[PDB]
Amino acid sequence: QISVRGLAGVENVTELKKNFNRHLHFTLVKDRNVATPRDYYFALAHTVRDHLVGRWIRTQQHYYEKDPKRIYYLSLEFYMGRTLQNTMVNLALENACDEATYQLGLDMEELEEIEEDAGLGNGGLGRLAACFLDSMATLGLAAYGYGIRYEFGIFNQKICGGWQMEEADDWLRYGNPWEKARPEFTLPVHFYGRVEHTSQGAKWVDTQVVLAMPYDTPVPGYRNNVVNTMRLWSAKAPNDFNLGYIQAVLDRNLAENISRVLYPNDNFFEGKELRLKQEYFVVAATLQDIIRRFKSSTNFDAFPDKVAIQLNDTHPSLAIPELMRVLVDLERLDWDKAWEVTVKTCAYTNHTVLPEALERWPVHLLETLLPRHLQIIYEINQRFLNRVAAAFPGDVDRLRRMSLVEEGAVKRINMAHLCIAGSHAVNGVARIHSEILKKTIFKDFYELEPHKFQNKTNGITPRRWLVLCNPGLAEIIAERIGEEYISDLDQLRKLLSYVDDEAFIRDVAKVKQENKLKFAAYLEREYKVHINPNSLFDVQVKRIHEYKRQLLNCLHVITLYNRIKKEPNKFVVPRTVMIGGKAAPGYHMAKMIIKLITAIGDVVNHDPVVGDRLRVIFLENYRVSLAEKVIPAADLSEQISTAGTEASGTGNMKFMLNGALTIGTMDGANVEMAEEAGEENFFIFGMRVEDVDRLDQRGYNAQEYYDRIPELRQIIEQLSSGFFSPKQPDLFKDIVNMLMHHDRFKVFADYEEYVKCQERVSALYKNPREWTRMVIRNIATSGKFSSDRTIAQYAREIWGVEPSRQRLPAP
Ligand SMILES: *Cc1c(COP(=O)(O)O)cnc(C)c1O
Ligand SMILES: O=C(O)c1cc(O)c(O)c(O)c1
């Protein structure tokens, strides 16, 4: 149908049709008289999967023969979403399968909608890991993603009476056709026990054993016949475990609970034992796998030439002392050699500077769970602080600031300090964030070892986030500049030469409007909500946090409503304001914010004087598959975190690529995006990082803003008095009290400038042609924010390997 989706050759279509029928009969054990759409989805998935495995087997065979340097990307989260369409796109099968299914009397888009999201992440960190696997395969790197196969991913969000309710995401219920269980490569992991010192060195004994069973998922590159592996571990009890009889069998659940459920905290540290077990479990199983593979290719001097381990945040930081434990206690390397190998192997990516996200584990937990690792950590710390003492003699304060051991009521290990000490490279995820690391939180470490500190600005994959979710936009671009941009996103710069082309302007605007109509229809169908598709689609989708300032959006929404009520017959640009995202189950303030948004909705959406000029919708159950629908439909992207708090963001980049303009602060990657597009083509507002520091020095007093801005005062008086909660007048007192007395994120300080910036947005939207021209300028400069660029930089500057766009042999 459209050229970017590949060829529908008669031979191929014919062969897909017979394999589809073969799987329905032999695999699913159904006939067409009893088959549901779900059976048809599974028949298709198995048909597509068969095309992967030939390339999968020869990719891994190729790596065995050529023995390249291997990249191990360790993460506790991989937020994969759906796999079917991605696989078709990457294999050039999408049109062929569409035709094949059409000829069987089936609508492929309907079958795509049956697939569950693999929701094994919380938000940005997990999604980024998935983006990265796609780019690593596309760039021909011998890369492996290693994580945990959680039985339950991020919870499904239900809204009941305006309140978030959680339910278990039972994503494996119908089976996962993409994974292959590999029970033959099951490995033991140890916990508890104690350390004995012999003349033969330390021995870790009397441990409890949990088994790690791997499940492999294929990760295909974009049209290059490379298929890499994501290996996810599942926890199994050994068969002698607890072995009255019945209770011993049932107690197997204790061990298997390790892989049961993803911790639902985005950017927040909860020091629970089960979480620590998950962290060690992934690390210990992964490292044995790495070492096995290395030995099949005494001399660990070559280990860093053959292995790179990338730590995604501090969650797998125990890789450092585990690698030392294996090298020293089991392989009998001397400490200094082992440490050299470790440092050259490991690299650490930091994802946030917020203190509540920092992992600081109590010593007593490590003492009980991982007694050998604690000893190793103490030894690492002592040798590290000896180096600090020699470099800065007499600076005793530096010694306690830099220590891996934090003193206090409870002693803790700072895992970020551990990662810096044991890694040859430490990076932030956007220029401003990487600079913040060197200036503030890791300043001491930067002074000791400046060479370690890098930047690697994040990116997103143009496969999932353009071709897959916005085929219309991909096509009209391909018409003008061809298809090479899909794996070389800088080629979008060629679109600058079409900024005055009247046909292009019209096509860009038509794609947006088609996307908006499709999404408006989706809203009616699944959620009984009727919206104006000629309104500006103003969207804020991301996890609910105080730092992301969904509350600032709320204050703007209420300002618009109040302004309409004051002058009802004045023209205003119509808006549909959409806000979506999950709150962590125990994050009470985030849950109150969700309730506020729905409460504003209840008032605004049923006020006849407003009509269809303002609508406020809370998008329920925001997840990767919902992102793929709403982002192509957006006009305005809300990226309004307090300056200095959002390390990078990736959502911001997705919107930029899909033809939305951005309203935001000079935070995270917004800075580099505005720099690429030109500040004239971005709606920047609010305090810079430096203004926030100055406000902190003087002391933030929110009452000042309340006293001098009458529009703000009116909103606070509405919230306090029960305007948005008549049955429960005091319902929002915690929100008001936070805003007035304890606001770490300075919502009121950016209110005036935000409101004025929003007026400029409205002004521009009234002139469709100039709106669309500015959109073209954003899309055309979004090339830097490809994850292919990011990964090429990791490969060259950290891992020491060369990317490649060269095909491997088909079929
Ligand atoms: C991209 C994405 C995120 C990250 O969005 P930010 O705005 O950068 O926080 C979170 N969740 C999902 C489902 C995504 O696709
Ligand atoms: O501020 C909090 O108490 C908080 C913040 C979070 O981001 C979170 O996931 C949580 O469970 C609690």
Written as one string, the DSSP assignment of 411-460 is -EEEHHHHHHHT-SEEEESSHHHHHHHHHTTTHHHHHH-GGGEEE----B
Q: Are 383 and 293 in contact (CB under 8 A)?
A: no
Q: Annotated binding residue at 442?
A: no
Other Cβ atoms within 10 Å of 133 Cβ, number: 25
Other Cβ atoms within 10 Å of 619 Cβ, number: 21
Of 39, 38, 13, 34, which Cα lies nearest the Cα of 24?
39
Q: Distances in Å between the alpha carbon of 284 and those of 29, 316, 320, 374?
A: 40, 10, 11, 15
Residue 521 three-state SS: helix
- Tell me how far the alpha carbon of residue 448 lies from the centroid of ligand 1, in angstroms: 35
Q: What is the DSSP string of 619-651?
A: ETT--HHHHHHHHHH-SEEEE-PPTTS-S--SH
Query: CA dihedral defined by 118, 120, 122, 126, rounded to 10 degrees?
Result: -100
Task: Give, for 304, the enclosing helix (H) or strand (E).
Answer: helix 303-306
Catalytic site includes residue 17: no
Q: Are 520 and 559 in contact (CB under 8 A)?
A: no
Task: Give, for 361, the enclosing helix (H) or strand (E).
Answer: strand 360-362
Determine the residue of 352, 542, 623, 663 to mutate for testing ligand 1's pocket, defined as the one with the most ligand atoms within 8 A of the Cβ atom: 542
Same domain for 474 and 427: no
Phi and psi at 540, nearest 5°, equal -125, 100
Distance CA 551, CA 746 (A): 11
- Look up residue 130 and give its two tokens: 């998935």
Q: Distances in Å between the alpha carbon of 733 and those of 52, 160, 719, 728?
A: 56, 21, 8, 11
Distance CA 747, CA 169 (A): 34
Method: X-ray
DSSP-derived secondary structure letter, 152: B
Distance CA 112, CA 465 (A): 16
Sorted by sequence, the CB contacts under 8 Å of residue 761 that are 6+ apart come out as 536, 636, 661, 663, 683
- Look up residue 351 and give its two tokens: 């994802």
DSSP-derived secondary structure letter, 407: P
Query: Cα(first)–Cα(last) distance of the chain, in Å?
Result: 24
694 burial class (0-12, 13-18, 19+ CB within 10 angstroms)? exposed
Same domain for 487 and 429: no
Sorted by sequence, the CB contacts under 8 Å of residue 274 that are 6+ apart come out as 257, 258
Q: Are 326 and 287 in contact (CB under 8 A)?
A: yes
Beta strands 156-160 and 163-167 are antiparallel
Task: Give, for 98, the enclosing helix (H) or strand (E).
Answer: helix 94-103
- Look up residue 303 and give its two tokens: 């280990």
- Could you tell me the CATH number of the domain that includes residue 296? 3.40.50.2000
Q: What is the DSSP string of 581-625?
A: -PPPTT-HHHHHHHHHHHHHHHHHTT-TTTTTSEEEEEETT--HH
- Tell me how far the alpha carbon of residue 263 lies from the centroid of ligand 2, in angstroms: 12
Determine the residue of 579, 624, 636, 787 to mutate for testing ligand 1's pocket, defined as the one with the most ligand atoms within 8 A of the Cβ atom: 624
Other Cβ atoms within 10 Å of 472 Cβ, number: 18
Of 619, 615, 582, which Cα lies nearest the Cα of 600?
615
Residue nearest to atom 2 of ligand 2 (CA): 587
Distance CA 154, CA 177 (A): 20
Q: Are 231 and 218 in contact (CB under 8 A)?
A: no
Catalytic site includes residue 510: no
With a 6 Å cutoff on the Cβ, whether 271 touches ligand 2 is: no
Distance CA 27, CA 46 (A): 9
DSSP-derived secondary structure letter, 809: P
Catalytic site includes residue 543: yes
- Tell me how far the alpha carbon of residue 593 lies from the centroid of ligand 2, in angstroms: 13
| Count of domains forming the chain | 2
- Cα angle value 360/364/369 (rounded, 5°): 95
Beta strands 70-74 and 307-312 are parallel
Beta strands 453-455 and 614-619 are unpaired
Q: Distances in Å between the alpha carbon of 430 and those of 28, 440, 459, 645, 646?
A: 47, 15, 10, 12, 10
Q: Are 736 and 713 in contact (CB under 8 A)?
A: no
Q: Are 791 and 460 in contact (CB under 8 A)?
A: no
Beta strands 143-148 and 227-236 are parallel
Same domain for 625 and 611: yes
Distance CA 324, CA 332 (A): 10
Phi and psi at 799, nearest 5°, equal -85, -20
Other Cβ atoms within 10 Å of 789 Cβ, number: 17
Of 152, 127, 147, which Cα lies nearest the Cα of 232?
147
* Angle, in degrees to the nearest 10, between helices 588-604 and 550-566: 20
Q: Are 6 and 96 in contact (CB under 8 A)?
A: yes
Distance CA 303, CA 342 (A): 9
Of 570, 579, 572, 634, which Cα lies nearest the Cα of 601?
579
Same domain for 601 and 744: yes
Q: What is the resolution of this structure in A?
A: 2.1
Same domain for 567 and 425: no
Question: Which regions of 117-239 does DSSP assign to beta strands (E)?
Answer: 118-120, 143-148, 156-160, 163-167, 180-181, 187-191, 194-198, 201-205, 208-220, 227-236
User: Where does residue 660 fall: left (phi above 0), alpha (psi -120 to 50 degrees), or beta otherwise?
Assistant: beta
629 burial class (0-12, 13-18, 19+ CB within 10 angstroms)? middle
- Look up residue 353 and give its two tokens: 């500077």
Distance CA 244, CA 445 (A): 55
Residue 669 three-state SS: coil
Catalytic site includes residue 566: no
Q: Are 599 and 725 in contact (CB under 8 A)?
A: yes
439 burial class (0-12, 13-18, 19+ CB within 10 angstroms)? exposed
Residue nearest to atom 9 of ligand 2 (CA): 265
Q: Which one is catalytic: 5, 51, 456, 542? A: 542
- Tell me how far the alpha carbon of residue 648 lies from the centroid of ligand 1, in angstroms: 11
Same domain for 465 and 433: no
Q: Which one is catalytic: 223, 351, 433, 784? A: 351
* Domain encompassing residue 376: 1-459+787-811
DSSP-derived secondary structure letter, 786: B
Which value, in Å, is the radius of gyration of the alpha carbons in the chain? 27
Is the bond preceding residue 710 a cis peptide, omega within 30 degrees?
no
Residue nearest to atom 9 of ligand 1 (CA): 542
Q: Are 549 and 738 in contact (CB under 8 A)?
A: no
Distance CA 523, CA 521 (A): 5
CA 52 to chain centre: 25
Distance CA 477, CA 508 (A): 9
Q: Are 50 and 19 in contact (CB under 8 A)?
A: yes
Same domain for 503 and 421: no
Same domain for 502 and 424: no
Q: Distances in Å between the alpha carbon of 703 and those of 199, 589, 686?
A: 68, 21, 19
Question: Which regions of 59-193 does DSSP assign to beta strands (E)?
Answer: 70-74, 78-81, 118-120, 143-148, 156-160, 163-167, 180-181, 187-191
Beta strands 70-74 and 143-148 are parallel
- Look up residue 406 and give its two tokens: 């934090």
User: Where does residue 201 fall: left (phi above 0), alpha (psi -120 to 50 degrees), or beta otherwise?
Assistant: left
DSSP-derived secondary structure letter, 302: G
Distance CA 50, CA 757 (A): 52
DSSP-derived secondary structure letter, 163: E
Lining ligand 1 with CB less than 6 A are 123-124, 127, 542, 623-624, 627, 649-651, 654
Q: Are 575 and 536 in contact (CB under 8 A)?
A: yes
- Tell me how far the alpha carbon of residue 125 lies from the centroid of ligand 1, in angstroms: 8
Is the bond preceding residue 768 a cis peptide, omega within 30 degrees?
no
AA identity, residue 806: Q
Distance CA 731, CA 586 (A): 18
Same domain for 489 and 361: no
With a 6 Å cutoff on the Cβ, whether 551 touches ligand 2 is: no
Q: Which one is catalytic: 87, 314, 650, 781? A: 650
Q: Enumerate the β-bridge partners of residue 113.
A: none
Sorted by sequence, the CB contacts under 8 Å of residue 271 that are 6+ apart come out as 360, 361, 362, 365
Q: Gaps in the chain (C–N > 2.5 Å) come after which residues?
A: 243, 297
Q: Enumerate the β-bridge partners of residue 197.
A: 202
Same domain for 414 and 284: yes
User: Where does residue 166 fall: left (phi above 0), alpha (psi -120 to 50 degrees), or beta otherwise?
Assistant: beta
DSSP-derived secondary structure letter, 807: P
Distance CA 24, CA 41 (A): 10
Of 368, 471, 348, which Cα lies nearest the Cα of 419?
348
Sorted by sequence, the CB contacts under 8 Å of residue 177 that are 6+ apart come out as 42, 45, 46, 49
Residue 693 three-state SS: helix
Of 253, 230, 144, 233, which Cα lies nearest the Cα of 189?
233
Q: Are 169 and 155 in contact (CB under 8 A)?
A: yes
Q: Annotated binding residue at 292?
A: yes
Distance CA 482, CA 369 (A): 57
- Look up residue 79 and give its two tokens: 């937020």
AA identity, residue 488: D
Same domain for 371 and 331: yes
Catalytic site includes residue 351: yes
AA identity, residue 102: Y
741 burial class (0-12, 13-18, 19+ CB within 10 angstroms)? exposed
Q: Distances in Å between the alpha carbon of 52 and those of 56, 59, 92, 223, 324?
A: 6, 10, 12, 12, 37
Catalytic site includes residue 548: yes
Same domain for 741 and 780: yes
Q: Are 506 and 697 in contact (CB under 8 A)?
A: no
Task: Give, for 538, the enclosing helix (H) or strand (E).
Answer: strand 536-541
Distance CA 219, CA 224 (A): 12
Task: Give, for 777, the enclosing helix (H) or strand (E).
Answer: helix 768-780
